């Protein structure tokens, strides 16, 4: 029911969705590996004058002790905590997460 979770959408279909010019910087979605349940990626739209509209994909790593992270220095207890956090602060990303991908 998470507006931003798109299940097993492929990398290519996720870029086609996110690359739409009406998506503001930071539009994003979370997707899952097709084979590995629980293995997630955060796909996000961005823009700069070098690459123009582009999509960045971050593997959402899992610690053995449980937990999720896209950069090891910032650990979360769940996907919702992580998405909530980067929606408030870029904290290293080029831009904070904004619109859930439509």
């Amino acid at each position: 029911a998470e507006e931003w979770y798109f299940g097993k959408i492929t990398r290519r279909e996720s870029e086609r969705l996110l690359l739409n010019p009406e998506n503001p910087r930071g539009t994003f979605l979370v997707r899952e590996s097709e084979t590995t349940k629980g293995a997630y990626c955060l796909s996000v739209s961005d823009f700069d004058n070098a690459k123009g509209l582009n999509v960045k994909h971050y593997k959402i790593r899992k610690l053995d002790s449980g937990g999720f992270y896209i950069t090891s220095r910032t650990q979360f207890s769940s996907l919702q905590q992580l998405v909530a956090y980067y929606s408030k602060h870029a904290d290293g990303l080029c831009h904070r997460l904004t619109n859930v991908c439509p």
Partner: peptide
């Protein structure tokens, strides 16, 4: 292909 990363 490729997976972004940041410090």
């Amino acid at each position: 292909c490729d997976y972004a990363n940041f410090k």
